[PDB]
Amino acid sequence: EDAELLVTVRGGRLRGIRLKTPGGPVSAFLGIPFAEPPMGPRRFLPPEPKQPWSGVVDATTFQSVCYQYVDTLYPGFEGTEMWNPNRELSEDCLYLNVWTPYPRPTSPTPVLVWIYGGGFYSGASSLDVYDGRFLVQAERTVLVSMNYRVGAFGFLALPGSREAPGNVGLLDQRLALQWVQENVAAFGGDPTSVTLFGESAGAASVGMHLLSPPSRGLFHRAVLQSGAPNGPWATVGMGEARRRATQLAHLVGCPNDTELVACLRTRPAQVLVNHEWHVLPQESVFRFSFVPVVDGDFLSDTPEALINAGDFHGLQVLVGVVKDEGSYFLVYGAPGFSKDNESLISRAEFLAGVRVGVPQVSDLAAEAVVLHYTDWLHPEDPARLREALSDVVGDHNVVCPVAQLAGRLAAQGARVYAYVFEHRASTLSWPLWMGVPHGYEIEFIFGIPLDPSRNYTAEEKIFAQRLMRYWANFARTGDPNEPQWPPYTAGAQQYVSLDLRPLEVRRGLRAQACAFWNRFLPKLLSA
Amino acid sequence: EDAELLVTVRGGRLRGIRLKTPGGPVSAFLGIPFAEPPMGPRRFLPPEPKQPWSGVVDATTFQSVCYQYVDTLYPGFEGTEMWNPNRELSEDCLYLNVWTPYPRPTSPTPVLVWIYGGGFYSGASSLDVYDGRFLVQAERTVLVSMNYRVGAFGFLALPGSREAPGNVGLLDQRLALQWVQENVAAFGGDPTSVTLFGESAGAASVGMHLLSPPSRGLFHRAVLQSGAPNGPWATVGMGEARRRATQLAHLVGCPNDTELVACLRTRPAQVLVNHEWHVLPQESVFRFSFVPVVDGDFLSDTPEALINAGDFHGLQVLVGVVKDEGSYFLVYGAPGFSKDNESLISRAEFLAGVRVGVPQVSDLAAEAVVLHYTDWLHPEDPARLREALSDVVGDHNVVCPVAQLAGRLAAQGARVYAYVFEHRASTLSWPLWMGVPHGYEIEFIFGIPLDPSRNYTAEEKIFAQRLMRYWANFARTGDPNEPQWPPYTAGAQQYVSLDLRPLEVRRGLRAQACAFWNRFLPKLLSA
Ligand SMILES: *[C@@H]1O[C@H](CO[C@@H]2O[C@@H](C)[C@@H](O)[C@@H](O)[C@@H]2O)[C@@H](O[C@@H]2O[C@H](CO)[C@@H](O)[C@H](O)[C@H]2NC(C)=O)[C@H](O)[C@H]1NC(C)=O
Numbered sequence A, B: 001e002d003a004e005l006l007v008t009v010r011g012g013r014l015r016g017i018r019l020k021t022p023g024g025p026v027s028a029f030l031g032i033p034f035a036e037p038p039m040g041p042r043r044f045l046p047p048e049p050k051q052p053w054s055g056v057v058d059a060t061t062f063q064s065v066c067y068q069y070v071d072t073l074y075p076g077f078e079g080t081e082m083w084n085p086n087r088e089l090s091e092d093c094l095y096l097n098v099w100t101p102y103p104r105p106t107s108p109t110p111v112l113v114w115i116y117g118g119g120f121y122s123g124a125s126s127l128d129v130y131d132g133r134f135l136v137q138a139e140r141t142v143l144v145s146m147n148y149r150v151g152a153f154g155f156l157a158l159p160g161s162r163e164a165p166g167n168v169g170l171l172d173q174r175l176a177l178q179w180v181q182e183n184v185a186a187f188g189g190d191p192t193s194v195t196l197f198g199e200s201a202g203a204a205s206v207g208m209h210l211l212s213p214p215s216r217g218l219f220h221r222a223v224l225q226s227g228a229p230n231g232p233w234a235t236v237g238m239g240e241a242r243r244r245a246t247q248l249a250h251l252v253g254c255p256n257d258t259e260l261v262a263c264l265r266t267r268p269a270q271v272l273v274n275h276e277w278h279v280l281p282q283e284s285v286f287r288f289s290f291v292p293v294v295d296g297d298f299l300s301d302t303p304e305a306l307i308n309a310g311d312f313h314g315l316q317v318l319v320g321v322v323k324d325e326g327s328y329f330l331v332y333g334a335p336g337f338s339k340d341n342e343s344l345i346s347r348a349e350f351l352a353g354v355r356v357g358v359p360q361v362s363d364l365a366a367e368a369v370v371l372h373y374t375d376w377l378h379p380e381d382p383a384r385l386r387e388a389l390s391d392v393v394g395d396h397n398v399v400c401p402v403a404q405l406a407g408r409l410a411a412q413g414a415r416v417y418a419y420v421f422e423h424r425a426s427t428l429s430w431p432l433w434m435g436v437p438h439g440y441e442i443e444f445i446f447g448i449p450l451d452p453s454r455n456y457t458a459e460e461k462i463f464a465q466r467l468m469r470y471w472a473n474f475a476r477t478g479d480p481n482e483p484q485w486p487p488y489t490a491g492a493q494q495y496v497s498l499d500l501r502p503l504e505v506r507r508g509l510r511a512q513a514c515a516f517w518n519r520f521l522p523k524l525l526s527a
């Protein structure tokens, strides 16, 4: 046997596997249990630490994916399938993965912890696009990724109840981070240099750990890609969480909070998934039924309030967005959109699309959106309308929540670096009109282009290596730099473009659009 | 005696004067009485037709200027003095002026009728800049201009009362127009071709005659320069007119409508003028105490409603603005502004200036203004802030009311031509930062540069001749064209730039800005 692939952690012994990479081997420990399986009476409850085991746990393959909806929108299309579960679904799903250089580092090595996105309703650490093998070999880090509960299993909340307190998926993440603190040294990782990074709901997760004191001691630096805890999709208030939980019970034949959860616990996991989208109150894109709930516990206040009131001295954070954050979402409900035509919508479809992209706001707020995003010299031009609705959804859900987070953190003591990712992958299957869509920077950060079996270009490989170096520099030092990448500040608002050309420094994260969403529109909604 | 200078009109015989002009002689009949002097018991009352006289009235000089405030902001500065009364003040002021070619035309000639601006509180037909001799000689038109009551004497209203019904200044204008119908043929003018033109409050007056049926039979075309009847300064509601009238009475020692007006009729004219500005409810620029009142009589409803509900087929209209409608107004009250420095204001002064320029709106509405007019990449640049406040005032008071009117008229049957006047006069006394300010296209339309005694460049003389041709072409044919000047439409929104260069066609009268003022902001104020 190979001693490099045998590790003893606090709970017992593990057997890993040696993996090939174009640059040399790496060691991988996949499917390490970090919590007791949250099944049966355990459903909806906070995770409990995994009890010690005798013998050797086989950490040689990815474990199951947490129960979740499977996207049926374009069956067999690789653009949607790459995000779907690639292992069987199970509620017995709380496992994490460690990648380390081969042979294992003997001196403490900086740790990256990946939190996957997927709207808090989907995702898995086993997806191909999250393969940590390239980052670990090229940049000599330890990489950890964990599965955490999603959808009703992670975030159904009956606030006040002990049975379904909400946010347990976030506690799954915290438990994995405590696991890293306690065991990552056994794999050569340095528990004193832990950088959290995540995308979309994973980024929103990272931010929530920044704003929750019990988690803030489990890591040192943060990377938020295309997501933020203050996103209008990332949290729900207590009353709407209760209504969504109560409607879900009703749709599956249930029924006292205790009595309601007890009946929910009797239902097959798949039954809850089958009705998940039906508890959304209005037609929408970029909205998800079961998300973190602001209840005073995990989050003592709203993320916006917590951001505006925080001392962030000593924090370095790396944030950014893709060029077209909104386009991807339009084909899941905006009238007139399809990946298979050019989606050259009419003004009437644009107007209807605005209510789908900004659901549950006053007619006055919707008019304000139409005012800002209409070119009144070309009010009915279909191409401009398509781009404008994509900007509405992208600005409102991603860019402007990210800009607000970065502005407040910088103005309150944190060093912030900002990027816009502007390269469209040669391999992208989605239509050209979607531009650079949500999620398609991840494969470059993880160095997937280095995989020879895939058909990336030679400068795409160099680009991936640049990005891995930036990300790993930030993990090691708080500074992505080795043309220079300057910090983002509330005044100068500098960020860099990431593409095949050299770094170009630019100003303003859609500053005009984000003044509307971050400064004016809240005032309108309060009055 | 000279027969060219003798004319008989319905009220009796008139003697005029022969005027010299760089291009040839013109006949002028200045100071023709068209109403009984509205003095004593007649103050605040509708005008009464001039009773016929025996003998010959000498119409040889301008009559007195209607009682009015005199601008004291920069004493002896020609930029302010040129607008101040150049004849003694009197309530005995209801006289009009006719200019005709010498010798008198042999065939019926098109008539231009000028209505001066001055915020409805000031102005006079005698000002040097309204000298009709050049238009008449260059373009062989008949030109008429009238005095009409201003300030409290023209527009103090106690709505419902017979003693101060309001709008008598507009009835002064209407009576003069009836005089033109009955008498202009005696000067060679064609009463079937009468074109109204006016600037600022005169433009708004022209517009109100378009929307008042009794006036509509007295003219055929209209020209609105830098003003519109739907401007937020040009009308007041019944209750606010009553409150201003009542506060004016209170401030001059007056306690029943008839008893109140009777007490006011005893006060010296100058005493009413001395208190005129004190009835404005809030600190402001571009607001005037006594303006046309929406009463159900002269205006069946608000100008905005009448515009939106009217059939305008068969109407030709020429409308336009200067490049910098707002700058002039800032030195009358916006903090940090002066003609004598560069008025490089701070953000704090800008914010304060926005409430002065947009008085009596909700805090939320003010925030919406700040959002649209702040460049959030340069929120504090003094030069940009100065230009932004000027655009706020120019867009809100002039450009966007003119654009709304032009768009509605075109879409409802009228042929519309639109211009932006972009030439800054060589002789201009105001600082360079004001650009092309409110009012400074008038001297070119009237051909004042052809006066040799003045020091205009030769190119300005050519330019004035071009502009007179456009105006007279429109007056004769409804079409300024002889590069072509296309009609303005709600869709294409085409207009021409007027300066020393040839006609350049452009699109949108500040369209992004005016969507905010005309489409969104009203919805906000009602909610
Ligand atoms: C672009 O596609 C949308 C969606 O239609 C789907 O994709 C097309 C490629 C084609 O295969 C359609 O039949 C598919 O349904 C079109 O909008 C749809 O129009 C139909 C009827 O005309 C309607 O029943 C759907 O609800 C519409 N989908 C909406 C509103 O989201 C759209 O018209 C296409 N654009 C074109 C053809 O120019």
Ligand SMILES: *[C@@H]1O[C@H](CO[C@@H]2O[C@@H](C)[C@@H](O)[C@@H](O)[C@@H]2O)[C@@H](O[C@@H]2O[C@H](CO)[C@@H](O)[C@H](O)[C@H]2NC(C)=O)[C@H](O)[C@H]1NC(C)=O
Pocket (backbone or CB within 6 Å): B333, B334, B335, B336, B337, B338, B340, B341, B342, B343, B344
């Ligand atoms: C630009 O001028 C304004 C107006 O001030 C007047 O004109 C100046 C040329 C100078 O002679 C001033 O003293 C005049 O009062 C300045 O704003 C004024 O500032 C003073 C304080 O110094 C204050 O008492 C006034 O109320 C201000 N007036 C207004 C209308 O706000 C302004 O500071 C000057 N800007 C410069 C010099 O950059």
Ligand SMILES: COc1cc2c(cc1OC)C(=O)[C@H](CC1CCN(Cc3ccccc3)CC1)C2
Pocket (backbone or CB within 6 Å): A071, A083, A117, A118, A119, A200, A277, A283, A284, A285, A286, A287, A328, A329, A332, A333, A438, A439
């Ligand atoms: C089935 O019903 C619905 C399903 C969805 C929506 C609305 C729905 O109806 C309201 C959405 O808005 C979602 C659209 C996202 C699906 C996942 N992808 C790929 C991706 C996954 C993870 C990270 C980054 C990208 C992005 C768009 C799904």
Ligand SMILES: COc1cc2c(cc1OC)C(=O)[C@H](CC1CCN(Cc3ccccc3)CC1)C2
Pocket (backbone or CB within 6 Å): B071, B083, B117, B118, B119, B123, B199, B200, B277, B283, B284, B285, B286, B287, B328, B329, B332, B333, B438, B439
């Ligand atoms: C004394 O108080 C005030 C006086 C004025 C304002 C506010 C005031 O206090 C709030 C204004 O806003 C007015 C500013 C105009 C004065 C006349 N001119 C010249 C002109 C005359 C006729 C047509 C076109 C231009 C333009 C600016 C006057």
